[PDB]
Amino acid sequence: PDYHEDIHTYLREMEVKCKPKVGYMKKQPDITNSMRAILVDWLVEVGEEYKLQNETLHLAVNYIDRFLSSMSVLRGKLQLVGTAAMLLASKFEEIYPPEVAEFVYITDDTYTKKQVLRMEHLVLKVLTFDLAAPTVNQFLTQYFLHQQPANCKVESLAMFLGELSLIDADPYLKYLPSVIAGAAFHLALYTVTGQSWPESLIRKTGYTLESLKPCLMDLHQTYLKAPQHAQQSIREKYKNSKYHGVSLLNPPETLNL
Amino acid sequence: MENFQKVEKIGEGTYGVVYKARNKLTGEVVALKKIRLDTETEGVPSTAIREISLLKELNHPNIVKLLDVIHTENKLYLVFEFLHQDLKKFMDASALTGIPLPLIKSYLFQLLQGLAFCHSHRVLHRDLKPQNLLINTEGAIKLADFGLARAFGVPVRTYTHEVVTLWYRAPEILLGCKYYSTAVDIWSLGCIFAEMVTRRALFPGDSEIDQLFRIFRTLGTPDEVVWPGVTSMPDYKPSFPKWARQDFSKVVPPLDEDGRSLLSQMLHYDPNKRISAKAALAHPFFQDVTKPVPHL
Numbered sequence: 001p002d003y004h005e006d007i008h009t010y011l012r013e014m015e016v017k018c019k020p021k022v023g024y025m026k027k028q029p030d031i032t033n034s035m036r037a038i039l040v041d042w043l044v045e046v047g048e049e050y051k052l053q054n055e056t057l058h059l060a061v062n063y064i065d066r067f068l069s070s071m072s073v074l075r076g077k078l079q080l081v082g083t084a085a086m087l088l089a090s091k092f093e094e095i096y097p098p099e100v101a102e103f104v105y106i107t108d109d110t111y112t113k114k115q116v117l118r119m120e121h122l123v124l125k126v127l128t129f130d131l132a133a134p135t136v137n138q139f140l141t142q143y144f145l146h147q148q149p150a151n152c153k154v155e156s157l158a159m160f161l162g163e164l165s166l167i168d169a170d171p172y173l174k175y176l177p178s179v180i181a182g183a184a185f186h187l188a189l190y191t192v193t194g195q196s197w198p199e200s201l202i203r204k205t206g207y208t209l210e211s212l213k214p215c216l217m218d219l220h221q222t223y224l225k226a227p228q229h230a231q232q233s234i235r236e237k238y239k240n241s242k243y244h245g246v247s248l249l250n251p252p253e254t255l256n257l
Numbered sequence: 258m259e260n261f262q263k264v265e266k267i268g269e270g271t272y273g274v275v276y277k278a279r280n281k282l283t284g285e286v287v288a289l290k291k292i293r294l295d296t297e298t299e300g301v302p303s304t305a306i307r308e309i310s311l312l313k314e315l316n317h318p319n320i321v322k323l324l325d326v327i328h329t330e331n332k333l334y335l336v337f338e339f340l341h342q343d344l345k346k347f348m349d350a351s352a353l354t355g356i357p358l359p360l361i362k363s364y365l366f367q368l369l370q371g372l373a374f375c376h377s378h379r380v381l382h383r384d385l386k387p388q389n390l391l392i393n394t395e396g397a398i399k400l401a402d403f404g405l406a407r408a409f410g411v412p413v414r415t416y417t418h419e420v421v422t423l424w425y426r427a428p429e430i431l432l433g434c435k436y437y438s439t440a441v442d443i444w445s446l447g448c449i450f451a452e453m454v455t456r457r458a459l460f461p462g463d464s465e466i467d468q469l470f471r472i473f474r475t476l477g478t479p480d481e482v483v484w485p486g487v488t489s490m491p492d493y494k495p496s497f498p499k500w501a502r503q504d505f506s507k508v509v510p511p512l513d514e515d516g517r518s519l520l521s522q523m524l525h526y527d528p529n530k531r532i533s534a535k536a537a538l539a540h541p542f543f544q545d546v547t548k549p550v551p552h553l
């Protein structure tokens with residue numbers, strides 16, 4: 001705990017500033033929630049193939065959603081936006097980002113390198129270089145320090161569920177990363193141990209189980225229907241022993257709230 | 258770029274030139290940092306992406322102000338407030354007159370305010386050195402060159418090992434720590450503090466091994482009493498010679514008892530016990546702080 005409270009407060013402020021428009025898909029004449037779901041699931045796969053951090057993935061989705069809040073994109077360009085965003089998230093977050101040619105290779109030659117480089121610059125300009133976005137993963141990492149003791153299954157399961165939220169713009173765009181993180185942690189804890197959103201976190205975030213309830217309601221549903229979602233890369237990712245096989249665990253039938 | 262008139266070239270880095278320039282319309286004197294884009298190969302340099310985005314979040318009187326980013330198809334120019342010179346140049350120019358203690362103390366108070374702000378907003382600077390700290394005509398000093406900075410997370414994770422300039426490089430990094438956080442920047446400012454005072458580098462090692470030897474020769478070779486976990490660090494060696502710590506009265510003779518106390522907390526081996534920028538601002542050393550204008 002050196003600057004832990006200063007940092008958290010500042011992240012709470014910054015997440016409101018990097019918030020995408022909740023209603024943007026209905027304003028995109030040519031792209032849908034379902035297309036967006038396909039895009040992110042693919043980025044999840046790029047993220048696994050290139051052994052990229054999880055935060056890079058989360059950063060890229062923020063970037064996509066903010067771009068699509070500001071510009072109409074045709075559906076044959078949806079993937080050019082996602083690739084440039086993954087590329088910029090990589091440069092921002094990774095010690096050893098993939099080089100640009102690898103970003104062109106993953107789109108399997110749908111676009112040229114020049115296209116990918118010009119999109120990168122268009123994306124920077126649209127975000128006015130505001131790249132240091134708070135993510136679900138950033139808030140979860142802080143919350144994990146309020147365990148006693150740290151539980152690996154709880155942590156992997158919390159990450160898994162925060163990551164599922166990335167796929168479905170409906171309904172996750174209406175919640176703030178810190179809120180999805182609170183839902184993810186409580187639900188993950190409750191699923192592994194039977195415990196509930198700790199009093200230390202209520203004191204920290206000022207989020208109670210009731211304020212977390214709408215999100216928690218949604219997220220529980222997502223957890224239940226996960227084996228039957230069209231997009232599956234996150235489940236397949238979280239069966240690896242790297243994540244303690246936590247996507248093979250069974251969601252509770254009730255939460256008791 | 259038309260509103261700007263180049264006055265002189267004041268610098269050069271890896272991705273382009275630095276200029277003193279003047280706004281022809283407002284009369285404002287600025288620094289232009291020109292960054293070439295790899296338009297056909299790698300795009301916008303990852304160091305410029307971090308530097309711009311981090312510096313835009315960092316609005317504090319002791320951090321260099323980024324005023325604008327001017328895009329073209331083929332270049333970025335970062336417009337910065339103009340600051341007279343760097344601390345390295347100022348120390349050098351002060352070979353025959355010395356630096357007044359009240360000026361040293363004011364500068365350190367300011368660097369620590371700049372630094373607490375960064376850390377408060379989850380940014381590690383990771384390259385603090387006199388060359389990277391900027392002074393004005395009026396007695397202010399500012400953190401600059403955010404080329405190696407990164408946004409951190411709580412708790413930190415594994416970040417780039419090849420980071421800090423050797424003389425300023427913290428012993429946890431030199432011993433190949435998996436993790437470093439805010440403490441690495443306090444180390445560097447500890448080194449800068451003693452160098453303002455003696456006006457020569459505290460620990461000018463020739464290499465990593467030699468860097469450690471120099472630190473140990475002054476501060477005493479660490480053990481498990483002073484630093485729980487040293488002997489189990491990846492690049493720790495049980496064959497290190499066991500040097501006795503010297504008196505700070507001898508390491509930094511001009512320094513009073515307060516200053517010695519502060520330097521000593523900034524240069525603590527155990528990163529966890531090394532003082533925060535936040536806490537350092539409360540140290541008695543700063544009770545009488547003023548803000549002298551330097552002779553320039």
Ligand SMILES: Nc1ncnc2c1ncn2[C@@H]1O[C@H](COP(=O)(O)OP(=O)(O)OP(=O)(O)O)[C@@H](O)[C@H]1O
Nearest residue numbers: 267268269270271275288337338339340343402404
């Ligand atoms: N805002 C400024 N005011 C005055 N001088 C500056 C300014 N910015 C840079 N300089 C000059 O340029 C030198 C270093 O600049 P800086 O470290 O920002 O660029 P760099 O070395 O190219 O690093 P990078 O490109 O990795 O950020 C200093 O020694 C200083 O003399």
